[PDB]
Design a protein around this motif. Structure first.
Motif, PDB file in Angstrom:
ATOM      1  N   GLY A   1      -6.751  -4.707   4.292  1.00  0.00           N
ATOM      2  CA  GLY A   1      -5.551  -4.373   5.053  1.00  0.00           C
ATOM      3  C   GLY A   1      -5.734  -3.063   5.810  1.00  0.00           C
ATOM      4  O   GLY A   1      -6.226  -3.049   6.937  1.00  0.00           O
ATOM      5  N   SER A   2      -5.336  -1.961   5.181  1.00  0.00           N
ATOM      6  CA  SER A   2      -5.462  -0.649   5.805  1.00  0.00           C
ATOM      7  C   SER A   2      -6.669   0.096   5.246  1.00  0.00           C
ATOM      8  O   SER A   2      -6.532   1.169   4.661  1.00  0.00           O
ATOM      9  N   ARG A   3      -7.852  -0.483   5.429  1.00  0.00           N
ATOM     10  CA  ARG A   3      -9.078   0.136   4.939  1.00  0.00           C
ATOM     11  C   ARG A   3      -9.023   0.298   3.422  1.00  0.00           C
ATOM     12  O   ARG A   3      -8.747  -0.658   2.699  1.00  0.00           O
ATOM     13  N   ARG A   4      -9.284   1.513   2.950  1.00  0.00           N
ATOM     14  CA  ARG A   4      -9.263   1.792   1.516  1.00  0.00           C
ATOM     15  C   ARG A   4      -8.015   2.591   1.154  1.00  0.00           C
ATOM     16  O   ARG A   4      -7.969   3.809   1.339  1.00  0.00           O
ATOM     17  N   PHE A   5      -7.005   1.898   0.636  1.00  0.00           N
ATOM     18  CA  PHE A   5      -5.761   2.548   0.246  1.00  0.00           C
ATOM     19  C   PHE A   5      -5.690   2.639  -1.281  1.00  0.00           C
ATOM     20  O   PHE A   5      -4.698   2.266  -1.909  1.00  0.00           O
ATOM     21  N   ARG A   6      -6.769   3.137  -1.872  1.00  0.00           N
ATOM     22  CA  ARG A   6      -6.845   3.276  -3.320  1.00  0.00           C
ATOM     23  C   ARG A   6      -5.964   4.426  -3.793  1.00  0.00           C
ATOM     24  O   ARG A   6      -6.082   5.551  -3.305  1.00  0.00           O
TER      25      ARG A   6
END
Length: 16
Positions: free
Chosen positions: A1-6
């Motif tokens: 989705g929005s890259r890495r939203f960890r």
């Protein structure tokens, strides 16, 4: 989705 939203104990990237 929005890259890495960890977010620590949370993980929002599994579904990109």
């Amino acid at each position: 989705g929005s890259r890495r939203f960890r977010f620590x104990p949370k993980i929002i990237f599994n579904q990109r």
